[PDB]
Amino acid sequence: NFNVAHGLAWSYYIGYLRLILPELQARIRTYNQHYNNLLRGAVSQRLYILLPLDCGVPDNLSMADPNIRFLDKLPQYSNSIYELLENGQRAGTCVLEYATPLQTLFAMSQYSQAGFSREDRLEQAKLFCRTLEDILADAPESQNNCRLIAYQEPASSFSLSQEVLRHLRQEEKEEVTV
Amino acid sequence: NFNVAHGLAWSYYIGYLRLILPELQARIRTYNQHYNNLLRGAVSQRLYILLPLDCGVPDNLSMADPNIRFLDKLPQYSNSIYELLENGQRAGTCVLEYATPLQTLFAMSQYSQAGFSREDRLEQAKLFCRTLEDILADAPESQNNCRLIAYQEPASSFSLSQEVLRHLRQEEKEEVTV
Ligand SMILES: C=CCc1ccc(O)c(-c2ccc(O)c(CC=C)c2)c1
Ligand SMILES: C=CCc1ccc(O)c(-c2ccc(O)c(CC=C)c2)c1
Ligand SMILES: [Ca+2]
Numbered sequence: 544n545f546n547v548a549h550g551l552a553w554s555y556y557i558g559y560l561r562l563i564l565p566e567l568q569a570r571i572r573t574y575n576q577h578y579n580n581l582l583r584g585a586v587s588q589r590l591y592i593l594l595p596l597d598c599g600v601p602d603n604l605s606m607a608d609p610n611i612r613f614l615d616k617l618p619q620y621s622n623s624i625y626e627l628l629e630n631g632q633r634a635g636t637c638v639l640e641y642a643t644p645l646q647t648l649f650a651m652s653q654y655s656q657a658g659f660s661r662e663d664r665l666e667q668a669k670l671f672c673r674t675l676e677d678i679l680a681d682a683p684e685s686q687n688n689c690r691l692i693a694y695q696e697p698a699s700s701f702s703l704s705q706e707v708l709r710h711l712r713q714e715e716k717e718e719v720t721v
Numbered sequence: 722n723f724n725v726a727h728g729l730a731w732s733y734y735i736g737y738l739r740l741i742l743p744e745l746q747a748r749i750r751t752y753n754q755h756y757n758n759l760l761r762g763a764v765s766q767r768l769y770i771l772l773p774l775d776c777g778v779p780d781n782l783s784m785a786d787p788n789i790r791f792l793d794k795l796p797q798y799s800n801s802i803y804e805l806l807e808n809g810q811r812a813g814t815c816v817l818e819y820a821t822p823l824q825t826l827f828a829m830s831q832y833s834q835a836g837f838s839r840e841d842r843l844e845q846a847k848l849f850c851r852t853l854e855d856i857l858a859d860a861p862e863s864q865n866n867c868r869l870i871a872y873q874e875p876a877s878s879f880s881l882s883q884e885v886l887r888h889l890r891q892e893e894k895e896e897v898t899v
């Protein structure tokens with residue numbers, strides 16, 4: 544009954560994730576030869592998808608957290624590698640991306656004829672997370688190479704960099720134990 | 722009258738330099754995007770060809786000078802990027818290569834039926850330098866993208882790294898002034 548998130552999630556997977564994920568690991572593997580050689584680091588293998596529940600998608604990641612600095616472009620329509628800073632030290636490296644459909648939810652909430660409120664936007668943002676999560680679960684070489692980071696920035700200290708970092712560190716713990 | 726260097730130089734240019742040089746700059750340009758991004762450095766654009774007059778070609782560059790450390794493989798039969806060290810600091814970066822025909826001159830000097838002495842080898846090594854130099858001079862997109870480094874290690878402190886470094890620094894002086 545009027546749930547826009549359902550089609551937004553399906554569309555985001557069918558029209559985008561399913562197309563770009565399969566080779567993303569190859570792309571990152573090809574790249575990681577040089578990062579290991581050049582900077583004695585490795586870029587995580589998964590695509591990290593930022594799902595802020597305020598549907599707030601900035602144009603630069605650095606505007607949302609200065610500890611997230613653009614690093615490089617995955618050479619491989621366009622994917623970017625970011626470094627995560629702690630105390631000015633590089634703590635992690637990451638192909639990182641806002642889920643675009645959340646801008647549609649924000650735009651709908653500023654569009655008066657939709658009758659879509661801020662409370663409606665937040666419920667749709669959660670449902671979009673739940674739905675995309677279910678879709679990836681039933682997908683074979685999609686769930687394995689990307690992970691979803693959903694968070695409400697609070698009402699107000701919040702480190703998006705630390706929230707990505709606990710995930711990056713978790714992913715690595717899984718690679719080496721299992 | 723029995724000058725082997727003449728054919729060795731022609732063959733080294735016709736069969737190898739002429740084939741791999743034309744794109745080498747593209748290869749290095751493509752690569753230099755990431756070195757600038759990753760390590761705030763740039764890999765010199767020319768191919769540097771080591772021409773030791775003792776025809777002594779080691780299997781590792783580092784065995785000939787520990788201040789020349791392998792860095793990376795030009796991604797692009799096989800070309801390698803080296804870093805040059807000064808006091809443990811990276812001072813330069815460089816696609817660096819021994820001229821292979823000099824191994825033939827060395828092997829000939831250890832082959833008894835050739836009647837080729839160490840004095841013969843050194844004259845042929847010099848003539849090979851002179852001849853390759855003349856060939857590159859009359860070649861358009863060959864001379865511009867490689868440079869020849871000829872040297873006699875003395876009889877005995879000698880820094881091959883410093884000898885490459887003065888050249889790298891000279892090449893850069895030319896890029897920015899002219
Ligand atoms: C209904 C919209 C979902 C949808 C469908 C197809 C797409 O390519 C993208 C998309 C997602 C992220 C992107 O970054 C881009 C390209 C922008 C630079 C497109 C979304
Ligand atoms: C007569 C010999 C000159 C000559 C002719 C064709 C070649 O490909 C090479 C050559 C030079 C440097 C190289 O590194 C290699 C491949 C070895 C890894 C071949 C020399
Ligand atoms: Ca926000």
Ligand SMILES: [Ca+2]
Pocket residue numbers: 773775777874
């Ligand atoms: Ca030597």
Ligand SMILES: [Cl-]
Pocket residue numbers: 574577752755
């Ligand atoms: Cl690279």
